């Protein structure tokens, strides 16, 4: 399944993910593609920060959804 | 009942609806007026994107409420 991530630079990257992929796997894919360590990633969708231990389907993230990458913190668990 | 739908360009669409109408039904009514396919519509109310499958009543949308229409590229 393709999803989009708006990166720190304002560019957008495409990820190929499982329909219920784990948030940790999504961050691992962002690290590989964009280079940001998962610990430094904060991902936002629908006004909510995405949590490790959850999956894309927990957030109703579907094909061609767009996530927003922001620097962690200062949230920031 | 009547509800209002405001575009980002500041036009107000008036719709006749019932609480039991689904969000998809509402998008169809917007298509009748505006020509915009439901797949290109996002409706926002009280801070939340309204999901296809749910009803107006699910979101406590009462008479005279204003929804906000935001366009999207059709999802493939």
């Amino acid at each position: 399944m393709q999803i989009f991530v708006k990166t720190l630079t304002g560019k957008t990257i495409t990820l190929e993910v499982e329909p219920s992929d784990t948030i940790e796997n999504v961050k691992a894919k962002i690290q590989d593609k964009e280079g940001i360590p998962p610990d430094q990633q904060r991902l936002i969708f629908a006004g909510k920060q995405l949590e490790d231990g959850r999956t894309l389907s927990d957030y109703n993230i579907q094909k061609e959804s767009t996530l927003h990458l922001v620097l962690r913190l200062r949230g920031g668990d | 009942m009547q509800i209002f739908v405001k575009t980002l360009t500041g036009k107000t669409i008036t719709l006749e609806v019932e609480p039991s109408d689904t969000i998809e039904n509402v998008k169809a009514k917007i298509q009748d007026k505006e020509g915009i396919p439901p797949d290109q519509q996002r409706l926002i109310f009280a801070g939340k994107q309204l999901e296809d499958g749910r009803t107006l009543s699910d979101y406590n949308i009462q008479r005279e409420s204003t929804l906000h229409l935001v366009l999207r590229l059709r999802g493939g």
Binding site: G47, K48, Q49 | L8, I44, G47, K48, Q49, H68
Partner: peptide, 29 residues
């Protein structure tokens, strides 16, 4: 700070975002 409603579309946005996730309007004017 606090989650913030977009002035245009009302979307309740995460405080880490400077523009609305739905309609791309900046938070403040």
């Amino acid at each position: 700070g606090a989650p913030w409603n977009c002035d245009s579309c009302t979307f309740l946005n995460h405080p880490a975002l400077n523009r609305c996730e739905q309609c791309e309007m900046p938070r403040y004017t």
